[PDB]
Design a protein around this ligand. Structure first.
Ligand SMILES: O=C(O)CCC(=O)C(=O)O
Ligand SMILES: [Mn+2]
Length: 201
DNA sequence: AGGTAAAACGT
DNA sequence: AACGGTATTACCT
């Protein structure tokens, strides 16, 4: 369990809820489809993304931001599914964050080779609130460091149903995903999904 | 006067 | 391929 101060991995926590979560990913994506976002610097991200809930993480020319509106559809992001919110609440409570109320869920899709380079989650104004991160499908190596980029990384395999929660002291810690290895999973076929819940408003 | 982009090539 | 440069710079608010 003990990843860092205020950080924990709940292994296979979402395993039982996974089938329903995956159906709801498909429902969300049918309204706001997965898209590979382009950085301010002009590079297309390997991870395909969408959002649900009140606020969605996005890139544009000027930087990163949380928007109530999907810039692709010009409609609000789909409502956060009850299955998402219920799972998130249970995970956060188990992790020691019983008062967490997310208003934002970023949905990441990793094809073979897709990565997410070391970054901080910092576009949220209320830093008191934790991050809840659900793994679905193919396994990936999760990097978890410290407050500085060059702080040593813990490398952890995240498997289908694993939930990682950080906050408090570890809230602004650098973290990332190494290039996804190809493979098969009975529920996702050829990809990894990640659900990242935050308080963005 | 701060916050931010790099959530993205060489050794 | 793990590690670290780049952003002690050029930009908007
Ligand atoms: O895919 C993951 O496990 C991490 C996702 C992430 O870091 C993010 O969406 O900010
Ligand atoms: Mn992140």
């Amino acid at each position: 369990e003990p990843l860092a101060a205020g950080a924990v991995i709940l292994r296979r926590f979402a395993f039982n809820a996974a089938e329903q979560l995956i159906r709801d990913i498909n429902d969300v994506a049918s309204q706001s489809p997965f898209r590979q976002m382009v950085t301010p610097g002009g590079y297309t991200m390997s991870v395909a993304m969408t959002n649900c809930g009140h606020l969605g993480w996005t890139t544009h020319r000027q930087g990163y931001l949380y928007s109530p509106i999907d810039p692709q559809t010009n409609k609000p992001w789909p409502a956060m599914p009850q299955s998402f919110h219920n799972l998130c609440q249970r995970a956060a409570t188990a992790a020691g964050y019983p008062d967490f109320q997310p208003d934002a869920c970023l949905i990441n899709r990793y094809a073979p080779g897709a990565k997410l380079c070391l970054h901080q989650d910092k576009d949220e104004p209320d830093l008191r609130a934790p991050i809840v991160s659900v793994s679905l499908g193919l396994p990936a190596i999760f990097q978890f460091g410290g407050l500085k980029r060059n702080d040593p990384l813990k490398r952890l395999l995240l498997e289908h149903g694993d939930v990682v929660v950080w906050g408090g002291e570890s809230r602004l810690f650098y973290h990332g995903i190494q290039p996804l290895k190809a493979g098969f999973h009975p529920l996702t076929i050829d990809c990894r999904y990640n659900l990242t819940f935050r308080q963005a408003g």
